Each structure stands twice: as structure tokens, then as C-alpha cells.
Amino acid sequence: MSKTRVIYPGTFDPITNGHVDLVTRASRMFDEVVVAIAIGHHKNPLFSLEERVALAQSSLGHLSNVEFVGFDGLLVNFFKEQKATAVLRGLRAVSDFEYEFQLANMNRQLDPHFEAVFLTPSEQYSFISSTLIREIARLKGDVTKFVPQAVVEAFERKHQQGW
Ligand SMILES: CC(C)(COP(=O)(O)OP(=O)(O)OC[C@H]1O[C@@H](n2cnc3c(N)ncnc32)[C@H](O)[C@@H]1O)[C@@H](O)C(=O)NCCC(=O)NCCS
Numbered sequence: 475m476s477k478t479r480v481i482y483p484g485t486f487d488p489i490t491n492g493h494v495d496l497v498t499r500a501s502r503m504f505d506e507v508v509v510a511i512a513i514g515h516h517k518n519p520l521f522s523l524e525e526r527v528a529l530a531q532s533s534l535g536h537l538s539n540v541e542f543v544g545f546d547g548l549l550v551n552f553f554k555e556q557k558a559t560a561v562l563r564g565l566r567a568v569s570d571f572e573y574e575f576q577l578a579n580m581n582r583q584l585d586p587h588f589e590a591v592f593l594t595p596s597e598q599y600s601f602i603s604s605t606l607i608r609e610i611a612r613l614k615g616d617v618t619k620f621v622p623q624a625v626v627e628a629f630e631r632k633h634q635q636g637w
């Protein structure tokens with residue numbers, strides 16, 4: 475009966491109503507949730523680590539047991555470093571599902587204490603992909619339904635400096 479600490483890694487580029495759902499749900503059933511933003515040097519994302527954490531903090535800060543960190547390197551090492559109970563992932567589409575197994579099973583080989591636990595989001599957040607949001611945003615489309623308001627504005631400010 476130690477305290478429990480789940481890591482919720484992602485690139486959050488940007489965070490979406492779906493992510494927010496998942497974190498909220500997780501905060502209700504574990505002691506600490508750590509939103510962990512993957513820096514991803516060699517991944518090349520649309521928003522900076524700083525924009526990404528900011529927008530996250532903006533949508534989930536009102537939860538007292540959620541923290542925000544950037545990390546790179548090996549999730550398994552992050553896991554160890556954070557003395558985590560488990561890693562949180564969401565399940566919705568179907569190709570996600572067999573990679574998620576690879577991930578879980580590979581990481582368990584690297585660290586037998588590793589553990590993945592999966593939530594499902596509200597049915598209304600199941601279609602939403604971060605990728606699909608970027609494409610719609612990128613074409614002056616209305617992503618208000620799919621992402622928090624800070625993110626909407628962030629998209630607009632990205633247009634304002636050319637996009
Ligand atoms: C960034 C990681 C976690 C993968 O997540 P991804 O890049 O897909 O970004 P995203 O921000 O979309 O991820 C958030 C998580 O929530 C789920 N999710 C994503 N979008 C939604 C949504 N709209 N609704 C519900 N769930 C969602 C996903 O299944 C994912 O688990 C990955 O880069 C990572 O570091 N994982 C470890 C990878 C690994 O072990 N590699 C080998 C050494 S690290």
C-alpha cells in the first residue's frame with residue numbers, strides 16, 4: 475500500500491480533448507499521474523517542448539495530482555528514474571493495439587518491473603488523432619471540438635507567424 479505513480483508518455487503535439495479525458499480518468503484512480511512529454515530531438519514536431527508542456531499545464535493544471543515533465547531517452551529508464559508503478563496508454567483504433575503489445579512486452583524484457591495499463595476514452599474522443607488535428611488546423615479548419623481552447627489559439631498564433 476505504497477503511493478502509486480503512473481507515467482503517461484506522449485509527444486502531445488498538441489494535447490487533445492482525448493488526452494485530457496484520459497489524464498482526468500487516470501488521476502481519479504492513481505495517486506500521482508505524470509504527463510511525460512517526449513522531447514523527440516530526431517522526431518521533429520510542430521510545437522516546441524515549451525509550447526507542448528504549456529498547453530498541457532493549461533488544460534490539466536487544475537488537477538492537483540498531475541505533474542508535467544519533458545523526457546528523452548529510453549522510456550524504461552524514465553520509468554525507473556521516476557519510481558513509477560506503471561505506464562498509462564490509451565486504446566481506441568486497432569493497429570495501436572499490436573504495437574502497444576510489442577512495447578509492453580519489449581520493455582518488460584528490459585525491466586521486469588515495467589508495467590503498462592490501458593484506459594479507454596469517452597466514445598466521443600475515439601476518432602481524434604493528433605495527426606488528423608494538425609492536418610485540419612494546417613488547412614484553416616475548425617479544430618475547436620477536438621482540442622482545448624489554448625490549443626485553438628496556439629494554432630492561430632502559429633498561422634499568424636506563417637503557416
Ligand atoms: C511518445 C510515445 C509515448 C508514443 O505516443 P505518441 O508519439 O503516439 O503521441 P500521443 O501524444 O498521440 O500519445 C498519447 C497516448 O494516449 C493514446 N492516445 C493518443 N491520442 C488519443 C485520443 N485522442 N484519445 C484517447 N487516447 C489517445 C495513445 O495510445 C498513446 O498511448 C513514444 O514516443 C514513447 O516514448 N513511448 C516509448 C517508446 C519506446 O519504448 N521506444 C523504444 C525506447 S523509448
Ligand SMILES: [Mg+2]
Pocket residue numbers: 603604605
Ligand atoms: Mg494521438
